[PDB]
Scaffold this motif. Structure first.
Motif, PDB file in Angstrom:
ATOM      1  N   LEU A 188      36.411  49.748  59.036  1.00 20.12           N
ATOM      2  CA  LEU A 188      36.056  49.970  57.727  1.00 20.12           C
ATOM      3  C   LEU A 188      36.411  48.370  56.664  1.00 20.12           C
ATOM      4  CD1 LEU A 188      33.418  50.842  56.869  1.00 20.12           C
ATOM      5  CD2 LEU A 188      34.298  52.109  58.405  1.00 20.12           C
ATOM      6  N   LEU A 189      35.648  48.241  55.968  1.00 20.39           N
ATOM      7  CA  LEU A 189      36.751  46.744  54.185  1.00 20.39           C
ATOM      8  C   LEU A 189      35.687  46.926  53.307  1.00 20.39           C
ATOM      9  CD1 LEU A 189      37.663  44.036  53.002  1.00 20.39           C
ATOM     10  CD2 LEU A 189      39.231  45.638  54.480  1.00 20.39           C
ATOM     11  N   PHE A 190      36.396  47.247  52.051  1.00 17.38           N
ATOM     12  CA  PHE A 190      35.564  47.563  50.997  1.00 17.38           C
ATOM     13  C   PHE A 190      36.128  47.293  50.186  1.00 17.38           C
ATOM     14  CE2 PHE A 190      33.915  50.831  53.290  1.00 17.38           C
ATOM     15  CZ  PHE A 190      32.596  51.582  53.048  1.00 17.38           C
ATOM     16  N   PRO A 191      35.896  45.752  49.866  1.00 17.51           N
ATOM     17  CA  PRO A 191      36.685  44.787  48.571  1.00 17.51           C
ATOM     18  C   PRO A 191      36.290  45.308  47.328  1.00 17.51           C
ATOM     19  CG  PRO A 191      35.426  43.320  50.533  1.00 17.51           C
ATOM     20  CD  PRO A 191      35.107  45.023  50.892  1.00 17.51           C
ATOM     21  N   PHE A 192      36.466  46.392  46.389  1.00 10.53           N
ATOM     22  CA  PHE A 192      35.156  45.886  45.486  1.00 10.53           C
ATOM     23  C   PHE A 192      36.961  45.176  44.306  1.00 10.53           C
ATOM     24  CE2 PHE A 192      33.465  48.628  47.967  1.00 10.53           C
ATOM     25  CZ  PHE A 192      32.126  48.928  47.374  1.00 10.53           C
ATOM     26  N   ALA A 193      37.461  45.039  44.202  1.00 11.81           N
ATOM     27  CA  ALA A 193      38.906  43.934  43.048  1.00 11.81           C
ATOM     28  C   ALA A 193      38.037  44.396  42.233  1.00 11.81           C
ATOM     29  CB  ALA A 193      39.553  43.855  44.315  1.00 11.81           C
ATOM     30  N   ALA A 194      38.465  44.516  41.124  1.00 14.74           N
ATOM     31  CA  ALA A 194      38.408  44.048  39.692  1.00 14.74           C
ATOM     32  C   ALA A 194      39.148  43.668  39.388  1.00 14.74           C
ATOM     33  CB  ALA A 194      38.117  45.126  39.598  1.00 14.74           C
ATOM     34  N   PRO A 195      38.666  42.466  38.555  1.00 15.71           N
ATOM     35  CA  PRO A 195      40.084  41.097  38.471  1.00 15.71           C
ATOM     36  C   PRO A 195      41.139  41.608  37.209  1.00 15.71           C
ATOM     37  CG  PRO A 195      37.661  40.441  38.498  1.00 15.71           C
ATOM     38  CD  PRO A 195      37.743  41.996  38.819  1.00 15.71           C
ATOM     39  N   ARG A 196      40.760  41.284  36.585  1.00 10.99           N
ATOM     40  CA  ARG A 196      41.702  41.884  35.318  1.00 10.99           C
ATOM     41  C   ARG A 196      40.841  41.979  33.979  1.00 10.99           C
ATOM     42  NH1 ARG A 196      46.721  43.062  35.477  1.00 10.99           N
ATOM     43  NH2 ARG A 196      46.721  41.503  37.241  1.00 10.99           N
ATOM     44  N   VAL A 197      41.457  42.670  33.089  1.00 11.28           N
ATOM     45  CA  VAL A 197      41.008  43.628  32.428  1.00 11.28           C
ATOM     46  C   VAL A 197      42.567  43.054  31.091  1.00 11.28           C
ATOM     47  CG1 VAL A 197      39.055  44.637  32.710  1.00 11.28           C
ATOM     48  CG2 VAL A 197      40.672  45.670  32.369  1.00 11.28           C
ATOM     49  N   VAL A 198      41.583  41.653  30.604  1.00 20.22           N
ATOM     50  CA  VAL A 198      42.373  41.384  29.313  1.00 20.22           C
ATOM     51  C   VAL A 198      42.011  39.976  28.971  1.00 20.22           C
ATOM     52  CG1 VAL A 198      44.552  39.613  29.047  1.00 20.22           C
ATOM     53  CG2 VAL A 198      45.353  41.046  30.395  1.00 20.22           C
TER      54      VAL A 198
END
Lengths: 48, 48
Positions: A17-27
């Protein structure tokens, strides 16, 4: 491996499997939107 | 401006049209495709 002997940790792994839920940045305290609008598009597209 | 005097060249200009037909790059002798696939997308999107 420590001094006298070795330690087996990770066997070997092949994924399924692979699950790319990467939140970019909170700035938001930099007024950064011009560079951010391409950096997050990197973080999605070419990273995944 | 030279030494004794000045030369008027460009008045001032405000545009009306815009034609972004920018060809990205014609180089293929480097095996460059991983960096090229984002650099050309820069050359289109964030440049224009």
């Amino acid at each position: 491996s420590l001094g006298p002997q070795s330690i087996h940790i990770k066997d070997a792994q092949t994924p399924t499997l692979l699950f790319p839920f990467a939140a970019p940045r909170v700035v938001g305290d930099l007024s950064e939107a011009g560079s951010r609008a391409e950096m997050e598009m990197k973080v999605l597209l070419w990273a995944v």
